[PDB]
Amino acid sequence: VASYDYLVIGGGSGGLASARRAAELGARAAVVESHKLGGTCVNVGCVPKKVMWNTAVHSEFMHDHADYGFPSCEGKFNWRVIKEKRDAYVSRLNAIYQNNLTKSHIEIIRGHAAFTSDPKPTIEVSGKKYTAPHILIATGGMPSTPHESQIPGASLGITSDGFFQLEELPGRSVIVGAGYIAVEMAGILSALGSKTSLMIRHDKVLRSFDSMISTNCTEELENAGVEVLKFSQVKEVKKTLSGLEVSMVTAVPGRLPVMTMIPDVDCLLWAIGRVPNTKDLSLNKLGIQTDDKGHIIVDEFQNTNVKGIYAVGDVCGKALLTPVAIAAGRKLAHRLFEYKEDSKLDYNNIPTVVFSHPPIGTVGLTEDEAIHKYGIENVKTYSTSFTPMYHAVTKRKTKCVMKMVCANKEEKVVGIHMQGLGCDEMLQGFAVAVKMGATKADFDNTVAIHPTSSEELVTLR
Amino acid sequence: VASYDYLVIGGGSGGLASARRAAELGARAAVVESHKLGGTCVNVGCVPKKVMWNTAVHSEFMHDHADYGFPSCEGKFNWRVIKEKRDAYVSRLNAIYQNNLTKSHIEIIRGHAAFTSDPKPTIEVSGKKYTAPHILIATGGMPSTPHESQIPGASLGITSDGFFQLEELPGRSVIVGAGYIAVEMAGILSALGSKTSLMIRHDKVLRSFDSMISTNCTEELENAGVEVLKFSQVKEVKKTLSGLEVSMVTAVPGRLPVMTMIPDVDCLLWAIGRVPNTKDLSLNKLGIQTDDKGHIIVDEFQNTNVKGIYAVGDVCGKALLTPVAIAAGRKLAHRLFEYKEDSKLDYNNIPTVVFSHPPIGTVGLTEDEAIHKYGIENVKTYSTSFTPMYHAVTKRKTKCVMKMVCANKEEKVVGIHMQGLGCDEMLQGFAVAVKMGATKADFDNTVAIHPTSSEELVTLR
Ligand SMILES: Cc1cc2nc3c(=O)[nH]c(=O)nc-3n(C[C@H](O)[C@H](O)[C@H](O)COP(=O)(O)OP(=O)(O)OC[C@H]3O[C@@H](n4cnc5c(N)ncnc54)[C@H](O)[C@@H]3O)c2cc1C
Numbered sequence A, B: 001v002a003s004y005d006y007l008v009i010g011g012g013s014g015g016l017a018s019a020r021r022a023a024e025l026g027a028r029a030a031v032v033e034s035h036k037l038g039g040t041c042v043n044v045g046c047v048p049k050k051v052m053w054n055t056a057v058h059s060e061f062m063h064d065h066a067d068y069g070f071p072s073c074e075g076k077f078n079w080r081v082i083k084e085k086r087d088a089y090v091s092r093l094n095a096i097y098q099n100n101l102t103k104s105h106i107e108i109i110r111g112h113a114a115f116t117s118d119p120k121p122t123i124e125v126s127g128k129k130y131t132a133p134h135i136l137i138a139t140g141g142m143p144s145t146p147h148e149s150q151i152p153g154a155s156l157g158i159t160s161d162g163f164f165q166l167e168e169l170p171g172r173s174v175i176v177g178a179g180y181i182a183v184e185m186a187g188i189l190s191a192l193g194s195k196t197s198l199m200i201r202h203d204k205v206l207r208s209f210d211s212m213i214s215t216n217c218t219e220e221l222e223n224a225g226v227e228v229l230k231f232s233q234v235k236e237v238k239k240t241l242s243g244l245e246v247s248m249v250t251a252v253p254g255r256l257p258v259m260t261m262i263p264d265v266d267c268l269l270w271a272i273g274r275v276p277n278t279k280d281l282s283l284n285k286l287g288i289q290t291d292d293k294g295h296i297i298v299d300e301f302q303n304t305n306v307k308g309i310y311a312v313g314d315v316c317g318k319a320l321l322t323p324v325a326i327a328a329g330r331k332l333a334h335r336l337f338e339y340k341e342d343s344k345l346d347y348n349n350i351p352t353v354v355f356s357h358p359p360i361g362t363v364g365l366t367e368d369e370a371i372h373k374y375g376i377e378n379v380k381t382y383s384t385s386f387t388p389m390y391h392a393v394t395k396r397k398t399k400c401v402m403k404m405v406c407a408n409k410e411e412k413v414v415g416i417h418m419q420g421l422g423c424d425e426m427l428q429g430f431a432v433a434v435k436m437g438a439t440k441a442d443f444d445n446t447v448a449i450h451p452t453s454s455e456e457l458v459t460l461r
C-alpha cells in the first residue's frame, strides 16, 4: 500500500489545480486519471467549444463583408478542416498538462479508481492499493441522456461529447434543452450552415438567468435563423431510410396539445443535463454522503461527511464551471498544506459567460433574486438597449442589452447582466468590481472609454 | 445684451455635456458653435475613426478566413463605399445632437464667439452681444502643421482632418508622428491596402506609455507590414510629376546622418500634435491666462484666473479625450448650479484605449511613474505574454501582453497596461476596480471567466 500526502482522484480542472498547488506547498501528491488529462474542459468542453465558436463568429462577420466595402465571400464551410486543427490543438494541450505534472513531481496513476472496504480510506487502481491522510474526489460528471424506457429511440441521439466527434456538418439538426450548452451548440451549428431547431420545454431559454437575458437571448436566436420550438418535447425517435424522424408533442398552455413529426434529421443532440461521475466509486464502502442525483455532499470547505475525504468540481453539482473547480481546488490545498483553516471559496458573485451570438455575460443576482433578498422597496435596476456602433453600417443587426441591479440606499451593485458584441471580454473587470462591493457611485465616478460598448455600463442613468 | 445663466462657447464634447447638465439643474443656457455640433469627436475624431477601425479589423479577419475552413476572400477594398456610409452616420449624429439640445431648451447661437472689451465678461457673435454670470470656454483644438519656413512644402501634406475627406485609398502613404493618432492612422491605412510608412523621431512609438507597450506596439506595427522609419524626420517635401517626394534625414545615434528621398507618395499625413483653439477669442481683452502654446490655464475646478469664466476639454491641453471633457463639464455644472463646491474631476486613473491592431488599453501609472512616486523598493509588477486562443488555428499571429503595476506591501494596483485582441472592451471594468483602490488580492480573489483573454489578469503570478 503506497502512501502519499495527497491523493487526487480525477485529472480534470479541479483535480489538477489542487494537486499542483499542494505539491508547491511541499506535499507528495499523486493524481489518478482513467482517461485523458485536462478532463472535460480541455477534451470535450471549454476549449474545443471556443474554437468552434470562433469559427461561427467568422461566418457571421463574413455576412457583413460586402457592407464594409469588400467583395462578397462565397464559400461553403469545410468542417473537417477545422475539426482536424481543433483535435490537434487539444492534443498539444494534453501533452502540456502532462509535462506540467511531471515538472511538479506529481505522480500520475493511470487507471480507474475506486474505494476499498479497508478501514482507513484507501483506493484501488488496477489491483494496486494507494492511501493518504487527505483524498480528493474530483471525478466531474457526464452528459445526461433519456432512458429508452421513457423515450423510445433515445439512444439514436448524441450528446455534447458526440458533437466533438462529428466529422461532417449535419444538414439538419435538432437540439433538445434550454441551458447554456444547448444554446451554444444551436448557435454554432446554425451559424455554420445547419438547418437548426432548438426544442425547449417552455417559452424561453436560460430561464435561470435574469429575465431580460432569457427574453433577449431567445429573440436573438430566432433572429439568427434558429427555429425555437417552444413548449415541446420528444415523444419518440426512430431511424428512417434517410436520417431520423423525431416525434414531438407541443403543449402550449391554454391550447390543445399537438403531435408533430420532424423528418430527415441528421443530428439529434440531447443537451438536457449533466450527471455526476460517482457510480463506480464504491462510495458506499465508506458511507460517503450523496444526494439522490449522485452528487457528493460537502460543506463550505469541500469536506465530505468523512474525515480526510473531500470533493470539488462538477461532482458536487454546484456552479459547474472550470474556474470554480480550479479556485475551490486551490483554496483547499492552501487550507490543508499551508494550514489556513479559513481558506475556502466564496460561491457568491461567480461570473459566467455564455458563448451565444452575441455572447452573454453575467455576475451576481438577477433582479428577482435581489428582490427576494432585499425586498422590492430596496431594489433598483438600471438598463439600456442599443445597437452597437459596429452595425451602424450593416444591414444585419444584433442588439446590446445591459442591466445593473442595485440594492439599498447606497445602491450596491449586486448584479450585472448583458448580451452583445464584446461582452465576453468585458465582464472580468466588472466582476472584480462587484466582488469588491462597488456601488453605482463607484461606476459613475469612473471615466468612460470612448467609443466602446463597455462605456455604457459606467454611464447608466 | 441678452443675458443667460450659463454661456457655453463651443458645441463639442465638453461644451454640450456641460450645457445639458446645467439645463437639467434649471439653468437657462445657450451654446455658441461656429461649425457642426458634436465637435471634433463626432465629425473628425472618435466616431469616423472607429468606423474605419472596424473596417480595418474586417480586412485582418478576412486574412484568416481560409485558416478557419472557409474559401479565401479575393477582393479589393472599395473605399468610397465605406466613406459614404461613414459620412451618412456622422450626419445622423449631428441631427440627433441638435435635437438633444432643443429638447433640453438650450439655445443654440450659431457663429464664431469672441470676448468684447466690455467690463463684465461679454462675448459677441455676429454683431450681437451675450453675457452670463458663468461662461465656459470649450473651444477644443486643431491639428498642428509645420511652418513652410521650417519644412518647405509642408502645406502639401494633410492632417487627420484631411484624412476624413479622402475619397480614395492612397496607394502610398507616409505618416509623420509617434502618438496614438499617428499609430491609428498608420494601422488603418496599412490594413486597408496602402503601402504605409510611419516616420518617428526616435526608436519607438507611444513613448509616453509603459515601456512594455511602446516596445510591443512598435513590433506589432512592423509585423503588420508597416514600415517604421526610426530616428527620422522630414527635411522637405515637393510635388513631383506623380505624387510627392519626401526628403528625410535619418540620424541613428552613434552613426552618420543620411538623407533619403521617398518618391511617389500619394499621401503625406502630419500627426505631430494638436494646438488649442484660442487664437481668435480675444482672451487678452479680459486678460485670461494661457501658457505659451495657447492653452487656457485652469485650477482643479476648471476656473480660469478670471471669476465667472471657466474652461474644460482639449483647450486646457491636458488628457485630450472626449470622456474627460464630458466628465469635467458635468462636474462643473453640478458645482455651479447644484452648489456642490467640492464637485470636480479627478484626473488620476483616466483609462485610454488606442485603436491599433491589436488594440491597447491602459489606466494608471506606468512602471516608471510608479517607481518615481513610491520608490523601486516599493514597486512590484506582474506581466504575461501569450498568443490568444483565436490564433491557435491560424498562420497569422498577434500577441497579447499584460502588465500590472503594484505598490507597497498591500500591492495596490496602480497601473494596468495591455495590448491584444479584445483589450478595447476589456479595460472599462478594471478601470472601475483601479479607481476603487483594488489590491492584487482583490483581483486574485475574483473567479476567472474561461476561456477568455481577460482571465489572465486575475490569474497573474
Ligand atoms: C460542452 C461543455 C462546454 C463547457 N464550456 C465551459 C466553458 O466554456 N467555461 C467553463 O468554465 N466551463 C465549461 N464547461 C464546464 C467545465 O467543463 C467543467 O465545469 C469542468 O471540466 C469541471 O471540472 P472537474 O474537475 O470537476 O471535472 P472534469 O474536468 O470533468 O474532470 C473529471 C476527470 O475525472 C476522471 N475520472 C473520473 N472518474 C475517475 C476515476 N473513478 N478514476 C480515475 N479518473 C477518473 C475523468 O476522466 C476526467 O478526466 C463546459 C462543459 C461542457 C460539457
Ligand SMILES: Cc1cc2nc3c(=O)[nH]c(=O)nc-3n(C[C@H](O)[C@H](O)[C@H](O)COP(=O)(O)OP(=O)(O)OC[C@H]3O[C@@H](n4cnc5c(N)ncnc54)[C@H](O)[C@@H]3O)c2cc1C
Pocket: A450, A451, B009, B010, B011, B012, B013, B014, B015, B032, B033, B034, B035, B036, B037, B038, B039, B040, B041, B042, B044, B045, B046, B047, B049, B111, B112, B113, B114, B138, B139, B140, B141, B160, B181, B277, B280, B281, B312, B313, B314, B315, B320, B321, B322, B323, B325
Ligand atoms: C483623429 C482623432 C481621433 C480621436 N479619437 C478619440 C477617441 O477615439 N476617443 C476619445 O476619447 N477621444 C478622441 N479623440 C480626442 C477627442 O476628439 C477630443 O478630446 C474631444 O473632441 C475634445 O472635446 P472639446 O469639447 O474640448 O472640443 P471639441 O470637440 O473639439 O469641440 C470644440 C467646438 O468648439 C467650436 N468652436 C471653436 N471655437 C469657437 C468659437 N470662437 N465660437 C464658437 N464655436 C467655436 C469647434 O467648432 C467645435 O465644435 C480624437 C481626436 C481626434 C483628432
